[PDB]
Design a binder for this molecule. Structure first.
Ligand SMILES: C=C1O[C@H](O[C@H]2[C@H](O)[C@@H](O)[C@H](O)O[C@@H]2CO)[C@H](O)[C@@H](O)[C@@H]1N[C@H]1C=C(C=O)C(=O)[C@H](O)[C@H]1O
Ligand SMILES: C=C1O[C@H](O[C@H]2[C@H](O)[C@@H](O)[C@H](O)O[C@@H]2CO)[C@H](O)[C@@H](O)[C@@H]1N[C@H]1C=C(C=O)C(=O)[C@H](O)[C@H]1O
Ligand SMILES: C[C@H]1O[C@@H](O)[C@H](O)[C@@H](O)[C@@H]1N[C@H]1C=C(CO)C(O)[C@H](O)[C@H]1O
Ligand SMILES: C[C@H]1O[C@@H](O)[C@H](O)[C@@H](O)[C@@H]1N[C@H]1C=C(CO)C(O)[C@H](O)[C@H]1O
Ligand SMILES: [Ca+2]
Ligand SMILES: [Ca+2]
Ligand SMILES: [Ca+2]
Ligand SMILES: [Ca+2]
Ligand SMILES: [Ca+2]
Ligand SMILES: [Ca+2]
Lengths: 403, 403
C-alpha cells in the first residue's frame, strides 16, 4: 500500500484547475506503484484550500475543480488500479447564514432540501459565539476560527454518514483521511468509519514532540506515539483505521542532520509509531502543512531522500508527497525505492532489525532481504552481509537487497 | 576494590620527595575507601618520571625517593589496610655501558653481582642499533627510544621474576601495573604474573579508538575492547589480571560533552570493556598520560565529576586519579560516590541496566539499588522509581539510592 498525497498548499491556485492538472499525472502515479492518492477537500470552503467547509454537498464551488472533474479524476485513478482517498474535514464547518442573533450559525448542505442545513443546535455547546448553548459539548478539540460540529447529535451523525456514503457512491471515494481528528473523540470517528465502511482511513492526530533540556526532541517519544496507538485501539484495531506517524516524521527531521542514533529507540526498536504498531501507522517525510509553502515542520531539504530511503524500506505504510515526487526531481530515486520495497514484498508489517544507529550511520535490515544505510559513514561493508548487492543509492543513503 | 593512582607526571619534581609527601596523604586515602594505590616506577631511570629504567635493583636513584622511603610509604599504606601496586616497566630498559661497538647495550642490575647485568643478547633480535641480532625477536611492540628486552630469553625470565619477587618480598609491593603491555605478548606477561603471584595486576594496553566519518569516535568500539578482553583470556581469566578500560575512558571523554547516548552500546549494554567483562576491567577518568601535564587524552575538565559519577557507580574496578581527588577540590564529591558504591556493596561485577541514554541524559540502575543520572536534563523524576532517594548530586549528575 504506498500512498501519494496528490496536492500541496498551492494546488488550488493552479492555472486551469488542479483535478484537471492531476489527470495528466495518473499514469506516472500508477506506474510508481502507488496504490492510493489522497485528494484535497472537495466541497465549498471559505478558505480556498478546502479546510474550512460549508456547503458539504456543493463540490462545484471547489477551487480545485467541480464535481464533474473530480469524478473524471477518480475515474482515471480507478481505471489505473489506484484508489482515491478523501480529506474529510468534519470537525468544524462554516455557516452560510446568520440567524436571529446576527451570528453565522445556519448551515447549508448545498441542496434544495435539508440535508446538512443545521443551525446552532448542532454546534457544540460551548463554541461561542456560534453555539447557542443547546448542543452537546465538544468531544475533542476546538478549532478557533469556525463552528465545531456536535458529533453526538444524531441528526449530525446521520446526515454526515449519508454524505460520506454519497462521496463513496456518487463520487467514488474509497477511503478517508480525517482532518484534525483531535477535533472529536475516537468514538465519534468510529461511527463514521464503521458506518461508511471505507477500504482505508487515516486520521490526522498531530501533537508536539517532547523536548528536552537542550532545545531538541527527546529520543524517547513514547507519550507521543502512545496517543496515536490509542486512537487506533478505540476506533478499532480490526478496522481499516490508521494514523499518520508524526513521531517518525518528527524524529527523522532531526535525526537526519547527523543524529541518526535517534533512530534506535530506548528499546532498540524504531522510535516512531512503526516500532509499536507498524501495521496501523502511515509514514511520511512531509505534507502540505509541514512542508510545501507552509513550512510548519519541514524535512531538511538536502536530505529528503534519506527520509524516503527510510520510510520506503521500513514497516508502516509510506506516503509520498506530491512535491518530492513531481517537483524536486527525486522521481526516479523515489521510484527505485518503491520498487525495492515492492519487489521484496516489504509491507506495512515487515520485520525490522536495527543493526547500528550511530550519529553518522543508521543501518537496518528489513525482513531479512533489504538493508538500508543512511548517513555519511564510509567504512560500512564489514557490517552488510555476504549475499547482498546494492539495490539503490544516492546522497547519504544506499540500500542493498539480497541476491 | 577501588584503586587510586598515587602520582602524576609532575610528581618526581616535588620539593622534598614524592614518597615523603605521600606519607601525609595515607590516612585520607585509606579513609576514602581506597583499597590499592599505584605507585610510580621505583628504579633508576634515565627519564625522571621513571619510565625509562636502567638499574632495576637500584631504587635509591629514583627521583621520587629512595628504597628506605618507599618501604616506609608501603609500610604506612599497609598499616592502614591498603595495598600498594607497582609500575613494572619491563618492555624496555636502558643500558649502563657501551659494549665493543660503542653502543649502549650493557645493562647493570644495580648490584655487585650479575643479576640483571645483561648485554645485547638479551635485546630483541631486531632493535637496532642496540640489538646484536642474536636474541629472539620481539614478542610485541617496540619502544623506539630504548632497548627492548627479549622476554623469551630464559635468563631474562628468571632474573626478572627474581626482581619481581624481591619487590614483593623485600620492598612490599602487592601487585603490578604492567607498563606498555603491548610491548610483549600476553604469554610472556603470564609467566611474570603466574610466577610472581601478585594479588592484583592490571596491564596497560592503550590503542586508538575507531573514528568515523565525522572526526568523532564510533559508537561501536568493539574492536577496541576485544583486544583488552583477549589479553585477559590469554593471560588467564582466573588470574588476578585486569586491563585498564581505555574504551570507556575514550567514549566517556566524548559522551560527556552532550552526547550521553554514546553510553548505551549497539547491544544496549555499556560500550566499554565493562559491558563484556566488568570483572577484569579497571576504569578511570584520567591518568598521568591522558591528563596531568601531558594532556594526551584529557577528560573535559568542567565534567570530570560526571566521569566519576559514572565509573564510581558502575561495574568494573574504579581508579581515582591523584589530581582529581587531592588538587581539584573534588575530594568530597568523590568520597560521597565511593561511599554510595561501598554502602550498597556495588562491586566490579554488579549488574547494570541502562534506563535511558539520550544526548542530554544517561540514567542507569546498578544492582537494583542505585540509579545515576548524568546530563543536564531536568525533567527526570518520572523515570526514577518510587523507593529511591537521592544519595549524591552535583553538577550534571545525581545518584539516587534505594531507601
Ligand atoms: C495545520 C494543523 O495544525 C494543528 O497541528 C499543530 C499541532 O497540534 C501542534 O501541537 C504542532 O506543534 O504544530 C501544529 C501545526 O503548527 C492541527 O492539530 C492539525 O490537525 C492541522 N492540520 C489540518 C487542519 C486544518 C484546519 O481544518 C488545516 O488548515 C491543515 O491544512 C490540515 O492538514
Ligand atoms: C604514553 C603512552 O603512549 C602509548 O599510547 C599511545 C597509543 O598506543 C595510541 O594508539 C593512542 O592514540 O595514544 C597514545 C599516547 O599518545 C603507549 O602504548 C602507552 O603504553 C604509553 N604509556 C606508558 C608508557 C611509557 C613509556 O615506557 C610512558 O612514558 C607513560 O608514562 C606510560 O604510562
Ligand atoms: C506494542 C505496544 O507497546 C506498549 O508498551 C504500548 O504501551 C502499547 O500501546 C503498544 N500496543 C499496541 C500495539 C499492538 C500491536 O503490536 C496492539 O494490538 C495493542 O492493542 C496496541 O495498544
Ligand atoms: C561477553 C563477550 O562478548 C563477546 O561478543 C566478545 O566477543 C567476547 O570476547 C566477550 N567475552 C569475554 C567475556 C567473558 C565474561 O563475560 C568470558 O569468560 C570470555 O572468555 C571473554 O572472552
Ligand atoms: Ca439545503
Ligand atoms: Ca470552534
Ligand atoms: Ca471539535
Ligand atoms: Ca651488577
Ligand atoms: Ca626499542
Ligand atoms: Ca617490545
Amino acid at each position: 500500500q504506498v500512498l501519494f498525497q496528490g496536492f500541496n498548499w498551492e494546488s488550488w491556485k493552479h492555472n486551469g484547475g488542479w483535478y484537471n492538472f492531476l489527470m495528466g499525472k495518473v499514469d506516472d502515479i500508477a506506474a510508481a506503484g502507488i496504490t492510493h492518492v489522497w485528494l484535497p477537500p472537495a466541497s465549498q470552503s471559505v478558505a480556498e484550500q478546502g479546510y474550512m467547509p460549508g456547503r458539504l454537498y456543493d463540490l462545484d464551488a471547489s477551487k480545485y475543480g467541480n464535481k464533474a472533474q473530480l469524478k473524471s479524476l477518480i475515474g482515471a485513478l480507478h481505471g489505473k488500479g489506484v484508489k482515491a482517498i478523501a480529506d474529510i474535514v468534519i470537525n468544524h464547518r462554516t455557516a452560510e447564514h446568520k440567524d436571529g442573533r446576527g451570528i453565522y450559525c445556519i448551515f447549508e448542505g448545498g441542496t434544495p432540501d435539508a440535508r446538512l442545513d443545521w443551525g446552532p443546535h448542532m454546534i457544540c455547546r460551548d463554541d461561542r459565539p456560534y453555539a447557542d448553548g443547546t448542543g452537546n459539548p465538544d468531544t475533542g478539540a476546538d478549532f478557533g476560527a469556525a463552528p465545531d460540529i456536535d458529533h453526538l447529535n444524531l441528526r449530525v451523525q446521520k446526515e454526515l454518514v449519508e454524505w460520506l456514503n454519497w462521496l463513496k457512491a456518487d463520487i467514488g471515494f474509497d477511503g478517508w483521511r480525517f482532518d484534525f481528528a483531535k477535533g472529536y473523540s475516537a468514538d465519534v470517528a468510529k461511527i463514521y468509519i464503521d458506518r461508511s465502511e471505507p477500504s482505508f482511513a487515516v486520521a490526522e492526530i498531530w501533537t508536539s514532540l517532547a523536548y528536552g533540556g537542550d532545545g531538541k526532541p527527546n529520543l524517547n517519544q513514547d507519550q507521543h506515539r502512545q496517543e496515536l496507538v490509542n486512537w487506533v485501539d478505540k476506533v478499532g484495531g480490526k478496522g481499516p483505521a490508521t494514523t499518520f506517524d508524526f513521531t517518525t516524521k518528527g524524529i527523522l527531521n532531526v535525526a537526519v542532520e547527523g543524529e541518526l542514533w535517534r533512530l534506535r529507540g530506548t528499546d532498540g526498536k524504531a522510535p516512531g509509531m512503526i516500532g509499536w504498531w507498524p501495521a496501523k501507522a502511515v509514514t511520511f517525510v512531509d505534507n502540505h502543512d509541514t512542508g510545501s509553502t507552509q513550512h510548519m515542520w519541514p524535512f531538511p531539504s538536502d536530505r529528503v531522500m534519506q527520509g524516503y530511503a527510510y520510510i520506503l524500506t521500513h514497516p508502516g505504510t509510506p506516503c509520498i508527497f506530491y512535491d518530492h515526487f513531481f517537483d524536486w526531481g527525486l522521481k526516479e530515486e523515489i521510484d527505485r525505492l518503491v520498487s525495492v520495497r515492492t519487489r521484496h514484498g516489504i509491507h506495512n508489517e515487515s520485520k525490522l532489525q536495527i543493526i547500528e544507529a550511530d550519529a553518522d550511520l543508521y543501518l537496518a535490515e528489513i525482513d531479512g532481504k533489504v538493508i538500508v544505510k543512511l548517513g555519511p559513514r564510509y567504512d560500512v561493508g564489514n557490517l552488510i552481509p555476504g549475499g547482498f548487492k546494492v539495490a539503490a543509492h544516492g546522497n547519504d543513503y544506499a540500500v542493498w537487497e539480497k541476491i
